[PDB]
Ligand binder design. Structure first.
Ligand SMILES: O=C(O)[C@@H]1CS[C@@]2(c3ccccc3)CCC(=O)N12
Ligand SMILES: O=C(O)[C@@H]1CS[C@@]2(c3ccccc3)CCC(=O)N12
Lengths: 274, 274, 280, 279, 279
């Protein structure tokens, strides 16, 4: 019974739209999206799925109750300055642009109507398989039900919890960038499998199934990841030999470095927005 | 309508038993397990689940149609030399000991009855959440239906495919050791999340959800993991900055090193069995 | 208590660091009188011999005298000296003796073959211990030999439990145990010297920096021994988000700190196997 | 045989430090659990859940803690401090000793905030660690401008009951944080790694954890009880050509010492930043 | 304007190399697709599926390929070779030229296996790469004991139609494998990394891949067409103080050159091992 709109019809808009429609919380036709390049693969794919597509952001705003902002962070202040006169009391504006603060969206839109309902959101592509990791912060004028509607909607395509907005730059470095860390990891493990004699197809399937299963084990365990590592590593065995070589390369510090660098870049993108 | 037995009641026996019973392919009472330390956490846990527990490996052999060998590779030739007179025509002997070849099991058991039906198996702990990665090779006397019964049984707790036996040492390095690589990875990402300001609980949940989701994306995509990495990495963005720092530490080579080292150790354990 | 009234006579062949540590520990525990202990060395000019002499331990340059005095006979010499000792005193081992080898890596099998040429059932126990027995906080393991009676392992556990932790292991674990708890205190002394340098770099007086670093190590170890929790779970509990600790942990990770300790256990274990393999 | 029959203790914050100190104080018998009260904003914390079992009084209102307490521990994150002081600052009284455990938060900043309500607040800055839960903590404290002489002596008496405790100049606390405050986390990492080492060479995990922890425990005790340099204790274990000296070489080859120096330095520098990026 | 009107080609193996060469040969117009036949044990291979679309004749029986072919490419893994030769060795005839593309497999080993059936088998060893699919392959070949002079000339003519091709002594083929045989994979890695570089600095991914590939393409063409040392071409781009020379410094600081040397060396040494661990 809700109308959803996407400004930007790229990778994130499609993932969210595909996830929502797959989840059954939203029918594809209750979704409208608009993009600048009106002939992109994501925009055509939305058409086959049943999403209404348009090149006019104003038409998208006019149709939606909940309006997702799915554009690069530097496009954001132009979208708000271009569509701000079109926001109404009914609108919930959900920003997904990396680093863009609730403050700037609220300051830009307040020039038009004084109590914009803004929610900042950080999600990732696996919403397309309904296994996303999502956090959101509610803005100054976001009503109580607004956070609940947001939590209800995004929980249908993965994990979702509210955070203080000052955690979102860090969450970006962990679960926002996370899937790319996993994709790099899977390509390399596949190279390893292939070096040791496995066909590439089998190596990719096995490496992925292992991560999927391991992550699920942690999610279902009350136990520390180190204790699971302990549980798996038989004395003198193959696994403990492999863990040693990871440690010798500082494997842990590399992933720590990555979360930090992604978080810090997100702060740089936010600080260059002001 | 099948009777299953486990020799060894440790981590792998429990994971498989818990997975099978959770999957509904096997009732807990159609499973019997035996262990040396008859007062271990895994042995007590099997009791609460409904698995029959015993300290006599002979009683386990007498009850089972399918008999899982879930012991360390050096215990294997003593188990076979101790229980070999008890194998019958009905028995399917499924070895899970790392590195132990079908040849040695067939040579040890042939001293008792001449056509032992042996299947070598490589699996991992996530069968406990029915997301295991399993491969198996059928032995000299394994009938046609034997591979099918094996594939049917282990597919119910995760992925399962037949391989040539000479791939299993490599598969061990990839999906056998895989979950421990993931557990180390999740602990470090959690350290990273925590360094950048996230609560530890939230960082573990987000890091795990990200891996679960990313792995599922790869499993459901026809696309190369590099193309998914490309799809996720917006120009100038946080993710591409994080991927750079991974590359600078040779992140890929570390995971390649790990699969290789686990595979090579598995060959060493097999070569020390002979 | 029962070992005191057991009125045991102990001998050490070799009067080096380990003999002194165990003698110091035993006497500190009250299980043994210092004069009911006899030790022997070919060089009477070590400080360890002076400390034993000052303690009241009986000292002699003749190993046979140490064998004749002993009920429990500790072999505390470098792994290559072992077969020359066994050849020299092997005729003197008696049925009453419990022979406890403390040499790194030297197998029970090798000791039994040497001694079986003299008496058919030598009672042999192999031991791996460490210097903190001197403050009764040692880490000790032992494996019982072919002819060790059940009471021999029980007496051994009681004697060594009085100076720290003690448990029986299968013998094929002792090499790994050497690399972990036998060499362990040296890793810790190195770590404490360095943490103290860290303190001094950041402005602490040296005495204070040494004191605090050791107390922290002691307290963390004690927390682990008393906790049912994984050491990583303890790590999380102290590491507040954005905090000082998590920043310090990061730079540890960036140097491969974990892999250095793994390398250390491994190299010590491998060297131990080499020391016996060079006794072939 | 020490016991503070007329002292009331309160904790602002019901996290890790509050629980460790309360468990330590009660373990020592110096304080009854019912004479201790704690407060938290998340009454669904694992530590706050645990505090209920020991018998410590729990409340969600910091004012209730301040009102029931003589000695008030501030066990909150350093950024929470200036909001906490604003909430209860009007409730501080002459009897109160305010003991800050927040990393980096200076005596000056607490005194300036509290002086706005009543002049001469009695403030003591403290740096402690989690092993107070097993009464082997390392604690230092610096006394504020208005803390009487009996104020530090009482705190030393209380904190000596859960481990080592000494007074230091306040400008040592940032470095002490990097050494003994963060110290236990370096040790937990070390014990995990050593146990991985043991497991690689064939030890059961349980045994490897036990032996590694016992070795660290024992060596630390040897150092505390010896008058000798840690290098001299190092020498005693390192028999010529032996197993230990080979392992020491590979530690040296990786710069093991410098890693531990880097860690203390990094924890102290972060502590300075948290203080300076507050003020 | 070249065309082998009386030649029949067969592939044992329907994998990557079979498909690349067949696509290349047909792209050049030198061979009609229906005059080409391939065989595979997995008739559900992506490449074997692709071969059907081009019109190449497909069969699961290696004997059928041998019987229909004049020139027979062995496009199988080096361990499959001695079992393949055992299956069709009795089917080799005087008209046959057997061209091995298996890495490391020596002319000697193929000739010894095939001489057991008919003496004087005509054998040519070949090392090629996947860019033959765009007619820019690098191919070398060594002729066997019984290959007539016209045998190598015919092969050079055929393989020159899909890229560079020259005859070498057989003991160069292991190194050529490490240079040009593995060469394209190093380049694909390089282009992925360069595109990551472009994307980091703000380029769209599509554009970064296009520009990176074009730069590699163009530089390679410059080298092939220039009489000058690659260092001299390097100098021409590196204006004093400029952007390029700063980037060259960071390549040097990571030992970029030595990595590419390590790679050729490692691929050649593995190739030697695969040959020696067969025989
Ligand atoms: O010397 C060594 O490297 C190792 C490490 S522990 C042990 C030792 C214990 C106590 C004091 C001195 C040495 C037992 C004998 C031996 O070889 N050890
Ligand atoms: O000099 C350089 O590092 C860069 C790299 S490309 C360009 C160049 C193109 C062709 C020949 C020489 C230089 C354009 C001018 C300039 O500055 N360039």
């Amino acid at each position: 019974s809700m109308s959803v709109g996407f400004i930007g019809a790229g990778q994130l808009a499609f993932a969210l739209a595909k996830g929502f429609t797959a989840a059954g919380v939203l029918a594809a036709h209750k979704i409208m999206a608009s993009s600048p390049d009106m002939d992109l693969a994501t925009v055509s794919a939305l058409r086959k799925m049943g999403v209404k597509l348009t090149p006019h952001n104003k038409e998208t705003v006019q149709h939606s109750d909940v309006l997702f902002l799915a554009v690069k962070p530097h496009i954001i202040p132009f979208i708000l300055d271009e569509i701000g006169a079109d926001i109404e009391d009914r609108h919930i504006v959900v920003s997904c642009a990396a680093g863009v603060t609730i403050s700037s969206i609220e300051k830009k839109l307040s020039a038009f109507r004084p109590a914009p309902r803004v929610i900042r959101c950080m999600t990732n592509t696996p919403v397309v398989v309904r296994e996303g990791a999502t956090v959101y912060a509610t803005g100054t004028h976001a009503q109580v039900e607004d956070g609940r509607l947001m939590e209800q909607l995004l929980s249908s395509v993965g994990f979702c919890t509210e955070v203080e907005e000052d955690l979102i730059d860090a969450v970006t470095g962990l679960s926002g960038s996370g899937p790319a860390y996993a994709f790099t990891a899977l390509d390399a493990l596949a190279d390893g499998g292939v070096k040791m004699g496995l066909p590439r197809r089998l190596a990719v399937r096995l490496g992925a199934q292992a991560l999927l299963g391991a992550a699920k084990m942690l999610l279902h365990s009350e136990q520390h990841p180190g204790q699971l590592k302990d549980n798996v590593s038989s004395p003198g065995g193959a696994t403990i030999h492999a863990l040693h070589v990871l440690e010798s390369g500082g494997f842990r510090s590399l992933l720590i470095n990555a979360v930090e660098a992604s978080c810090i870049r997100t702060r740089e993108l936010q600080s260059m927005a002001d």
